[PDB]
Design an enzyme around this catalytic site. Structure first.
Site, PDB file in Angstrom:
ATOM      1  N   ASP A 246      -1.084   5.480  -5.795  1.00  0.00           N
ATOM      2  CA  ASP A 246      -1.586   4.646  -4.696  1.00  0.00           C
ATOM      3  C   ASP A 246      -1.915   3.213  -5.106  1.00  0.00           C
ATOM      4  O   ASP A 246      -2.969   2.954  -5.699  1.00  0.00           O
ATOM      5  CB  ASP A 246      -2.818   5.310  -4.053  1.00  0.00           C
ATOM      6  CG  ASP A 246      -3.306   4.575  -2.818  1.00  0.00           C
ATOM      7  OD1 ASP A 246      -2.559   3.710  -2.293  1.00  0.00           O
ATOM      8  OD2 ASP A 246      -4.445   4.864  -2.355  1.00  0.00           O
TER       9      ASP A 246
ATOM     10  N   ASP B  54       0.811  -1.222   0.000  1.00  0.00           N
ATOM     11  CA  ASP B  54       0.000   0.000   0.000  1.00  0.00           C
ATOM     12  C   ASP B  54       0.844   1.271   0.000  1.00  0.00           C
ATOM     13  O   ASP B  54       1.293   1.735   1.044  1.00  0.00           O
ATOM     14  CB  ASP B  54      -0.944  -0.007   1.199  1.00  0.00           C
ATOM     15  CG  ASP B  54      -1.955   1.136   1.166  1.00  0.00           C
ATOM     16  OD1 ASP B  54      -2.048   1.864   0.152  1.00  0.00           O
ATOM     17  OD2 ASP B  54      -2.679   1.287   2.170  1.00  0.00           O
TER      18      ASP B  54
HETATM   19  C1  3UX Z   1      -7.152   4.109  -0.507  1.00  0.00           C
HETATM   20  N1  3UX Z   1      -6.643   3.260   0.570  1.00  0.00           N
HETATM   21  C2  3UX Z   1      -7.414   2.667   1.511  1.00  0.00           C
HETATM   22  O1  3UX Z   1      -8.638   2.738   1.649  1.00  0.00           O
HETATM   23  C3  3UX Z   1      -6.513   1.859   2.446  1.00  0.00           C
HETATM   24  N2  3UX Z   1      -5.206   2.128   1.848  1.00  0.00           N
HETATM   25  C4  3UX Z   1      -5.360   2.893   0.818  1.00  0.00           C
HETATM   26  N3  3UX Z   1      -4.364   3.359  -0.017  1.00  0.00           N
HETATM   27  C5  3UX Z   1      -6.909   0.384   2.402  1.00  0.00           C
HETATM   28  C6  3UX Z   1      -7.112  -0.246   1.147  1.00  0.00           C
HETATM   29  C7  3UX Z   1      -7.499  -1.610   1.068  1.00  0.00           C
HETATM   30  C8  3UX Z   1      -7.724  -2.189  -0.209  1.00  0.00           C
HETATM   31  C9  3UX Z   1      -8.992  -2.771  -0.487  1.00  0.00           C
HETATM   32  C10 3UX Z   1      -9.211  -3.315  -1.778  1.00  0.00           C
HETATM   33  C11 3UX Z   1      -8.178  -3.247  -2.748  1.00  0.00           C
HETATM   34  N4  3UX Z   1      -6.981  -2.678  -2.484  1.00  0.00           N
HETATM   35  C12 3UX Z   1      -6.762  -2.161  -1.254  1.00  0.00           C
HETATM   36  F1  3UX Z   1      -5.547  -1.611  -1.043  1.00  0.00           F
HETATM   37  C13 3UX Z   1      -7.708  -2.329   2.275  1.00  0.00           C
HETATM   38  C14 3UX Z   1      -7.517  -1.693   3.530  1.00  0.00           C
HETATM   39  C15 3UX Z   1      -7.112  -0.336   3.611  1.00  0.00           C
HETATM   40  O2  3UX Z   1      -6.921   0.257   4.857  1.00  0.00           O
HETATM   41  C16 3UX Z   1      -6.148   1.453   4.972  1.00  0.00           C
HETATM   42  C17 3UX Z   1      -4.636   1.122   4.824  1.00  0.00           C
HETATM   43  C18 3UX Z   1      -6.407   2.082   6.367  1.00  0.00           C
HETATM   44  C19 3UX Z   1      -6.002   3.581   6.414  1.00  0.00           C
HETATM   45  C20 3UX Z   1      -6.501   4.397   5.190  1.00  0.00           C
HETATM   46  O3  3UX Z   1      -6.148   3.727   3.964  1.00  0.00           O
HETATM   47  C21 3UX Z   1      -6.669   2.408   3.869  1.00  0.00           C
END
Ligand code: 3UX
Ligand code: NI
Length: 393
Positions: free
Chosen positions: A223, A34
């Site tokens: 991202d 991420d």
């Molecule tokens: C936009 N974005 C999120 O919503 C997030 N990471 C990113 N970059 C994220 C994306 C996904 C996901 C779900 C499905 C597919 N891919 C993912 F990365 C899963 C969990 C998640 O949790 C966080 C880490 C918690 C804090 C805020 O960000 C979140």
């Protein structure tokens, strides 16, 4: 970097993960990669969607930091206990580091049924770490404790189950077998998210002709943790209008353009040529220069296999509206080999050796484009009293 090639896996729309180990002896977990967050956070209690989790009691090297962490976000939350332990990436560099680990003990709409990942590797900068910027992110710890160069690169490659995806995360270098042609760099505007500046947008070679600050309102970021290309409201509307016009021979329901409904054609007959290419011009390393990355409908229309009509090729529209700026997500990244050159505060793009294309068009990275007396396309986020009051010692 042969040992790092093909080290990413996942399910379409559910993120790309890398195998990591935590603790002594090593406990293997699958960890979402991420670039849009900055915590290393792993499931550390039972959950309906987890087959396994980090067992702190099984680790001789685990240390409790005696501090909790609470991370709410849009329509979700995770929380847990901060600690440190030994961490390695089996198909990464041959090193072991002591990193911060947030042991997730409670969550809501965080884990995804069937995604096969149990944690998240936040690769962005300390500024956006939780609870605060004093919690050193994983990559910072890796660089400080080892001789690993301060750079990583990502090659994301695109009837009962979701389509499997694969790719590569090369830690500490650039693997020349993962791209073709030129590698073009855009500055990281600020080290928090991987923030960049978009100077121009074209849909089928036609300029959207908006004030370029609109493209970066209120930021533009790269991202791997976002599936879609996400665009600010005004930009999204202009883009949809242009894509609608180009594809007008087909009349899709409003649901499709909202990403709420699939559209289908009989197997192998998808009329790719009626959907336009999308070009994003990114600010170059040289002041008045830019380069463009061009993506195909093969990137922004996501294949989703239907059970009811498995004989058809069906697609979701993977461009969506944002109120928090541009997000170049997996949609964008799947066209390209993307170099997160932290050492030189820049992000590189080159055509990926694995991107999906046809015999008429290809994803491209082209430049330079020079503009006389180029405007400042960056947006300055209004400063809150909360933020201003923070001391940064
Ligand atoms: C936009 N974005 C999120 O919503 C997030 N990471 C990113 N970059 C994220 C994306 C996904 C996901 C779900 C499905 C597919 N891919 C993912 F990365 C899963 C969990 C998640 O949790 C966080 C880490 C918690 C804090 C805020 O960000 C979140
Ligand atoms: Ni102070």
């Amino acid at each position: 970097f042969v040992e790092m090639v093909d080290n990413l896996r996942g399910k379409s729309g559910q993120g790309y993960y890398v195998e990591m180990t935590v603790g002594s002896p090593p406990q293997t977990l699958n960890i979402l990669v991420d670039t849009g967050s900055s915590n290393f956070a792993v499931g550390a209690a039972p959950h309906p969607f987890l087959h396994r989790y980090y067992q702190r009691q099984l680790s001789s090297t685990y240390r409790d930091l005696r501090k909790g962490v609470y991370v709410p976000y849009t329509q979700g939350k995770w929380e847990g206990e901060l600690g440190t332990d030994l961490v390695s990436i089996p198909h990464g560099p041959n090193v072991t580091v002591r990193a911060n680990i947030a042991a997730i003990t409670e969550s809501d709409k965080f884990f995804i049924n069937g995604s096969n990942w149990e944690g998240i590797l936040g690769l962005a900068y300390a500024e956006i770490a939780r609870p605060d910027d004093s919690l050193e992110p994983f990559f910072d710890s890796l660089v400080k404790q080892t001789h690993v160069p301060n750079l990583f690169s990502l090659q994301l490659c695109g009837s009962e189950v979701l389509a499997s995806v694969g790719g590569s995360m090369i830690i500490g270098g650039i693997d020349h077998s993962l791209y073709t042609g030129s590698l073009w760099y855009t500055p990281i505007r600020r080290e928090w998210y991987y923030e960049v500046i978009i100077v121009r947008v074209e849909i089928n070679g036609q300029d959207l002709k908006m004030d370029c600050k609109e493209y970066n309102y209120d930021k533009s970021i790269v991202d791997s943790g976002t599936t879609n290309l996400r665009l600010p409201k005004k930009v999204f509307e202009a883009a949809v209008k242009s894509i609608k016009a180009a594809s007008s021979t087909e009349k899709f329901p409003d649901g499709f353009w909202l990403g709420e409904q699939l559209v289908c054609w009989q197997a192998g007959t998808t009329p790719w040529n009626i959907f336009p290419v999308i070009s994003l011009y990114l600010m170059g390393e040289v002041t008045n220069q830019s380069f463009r990355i061009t993506i195909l409908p093969q990137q922004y229309l996501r294949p989703v296999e239907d059970v009811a009509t498995s004989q058809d090729d069906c697609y979701k529209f993977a461009i969506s509206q944002s109120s928090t700026g541009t997000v170049m997500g997996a949609v964008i990244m799947e066209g390209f080999y993307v170099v997160f050159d932290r050492a030189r505060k820049r992000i590189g793009f080159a055509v990926s050796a694995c991107h999906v294309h046809d015999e008429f068009r290809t994803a491209a990275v082209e430049g330079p484009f020079v503009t006389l007396d180029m405007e400042d396309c960056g947006y300055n986020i209004p400063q809150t009293d909360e933020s201003r009051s923070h001391h940064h010692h």
